[model samples]
Target: LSPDLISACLALEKYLDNPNALTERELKVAYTTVLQEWLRLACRSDAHPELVRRHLVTFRAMSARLLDYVVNIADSNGNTVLHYSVSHANFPVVQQLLDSGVCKVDKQNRAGYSPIMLTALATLKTQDDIETVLQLFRLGNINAKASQAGQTALMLAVSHGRVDVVKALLACEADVNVQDDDGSTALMCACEHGHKEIAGLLLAVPSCDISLTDRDGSTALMVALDAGQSEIASMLYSRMNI
Candidate 1:
């Protein structure tokens, strides 16, 4: 390798391992590569977590023109920078990615998990999970039906017992009655899992169809009754009677 190429390669490794050490000039120099190897280095998944973090940090510290290079860089798993950021629970990085005007908010990974659905399925131990979903909605109308098993974000939220995620997706106007391949709605998921709070959240949606039957010709109320969730069954019965 030539002096410039070797130096650029060294800088790339340093930047990936410790982005704080990368100077502004180094950022630009690394990009003027031998056939633009900078991007390949940036998107490589061998280092996985650290590589993704540095890539995001580089994007933030660099010029907007460079944003295009990493916007759609998917790893071997078909997970975009967006997916990586959300999976790592880097909400600030997530905001930057979305606001950069380059993010494909609804793009799904190899697992068919879009950024929106990922936010639903991601582990939540803080308010960031709720805020993340709300922030993603601000970008555009995300495809709520992008789950691998024909489940919607709302259904995933209910299945995970994430009341906050459920609320956020619902507030974004996720289809309350969208059924999965098994003919299961968010309501059924909530009832099947005994998530009373989520069930109420679904029931409160004026457009929610509580009487929708699954493939077995069973409604959410039946599921609740079978699951021995008397409260949920009664709520569904009352909602149906009304």
Candidate 2:
């Protein structure tokens, strides 16, 4: 018979060195967790929803090493497992990561898009999309900005004409005054894109500053007027009057 495989022995060594396990039962459970995590990372299927669900089910307490590694490691696109899950509005997977309580939420992709930012920008036509964005919003920094433009989750939602997302962001008190590279804010993006309802929503927020101007010295009213969005222009005008 051939000698025991060297690679197998090396792999087995990790299981033997677990410290701090006081009882046989506890030690066995720890060994099981280590093996499951090893298999999970080895499969490279961290981005799958099923895998996320199974991770939550098998290890409710969860291992610290596994939680940070699986959720934060990025792919070639500079996208982590959290990014992939949020981009598709995968609530189940995202919820599992959130449930684990260690998702590194500030990571941005190659384009400077955070998971919450991507969730806002995704075109999923369902409440699940909104729900997924909301979940991340509750857990991550709502004001986290995209690096290149410094745009935020609320601004992205407004730019994309997602009223559902816009409403939730507002209700959560997302900074309505956050300016992007062009100095444009959520209201400005809403106006420039002719998003009337979104503009109305922003107008309703007392903190919404209509007098603030973008790089071109254009306020939300001016952007609305320039885009031929008369209704939003009036909305801005009315908000400005108060």
Name the candidate that leads on lDDT. 1
Candidate 1, residues 1-242, lDDT tens digits: the string is 24664455556566656778788787666645522443344333232544445555655465443445456655567777677666656665666566566788878888887877777766655676567668786675554576477887777778878777787777888888788889998898898899998898889899888778999999888899999999998888778774
TM-score of each: 0.72, 0.75
Count backbone clashes in candidate 2: 0
Candidate 2: stretches off by over 4 Å: 1-51, 56-62, 123-132
- Candidate 1 residue pairs in clash (backbone atoms < 3 Å): none
Candidate lDDT values, in order = 0.70, 0.69
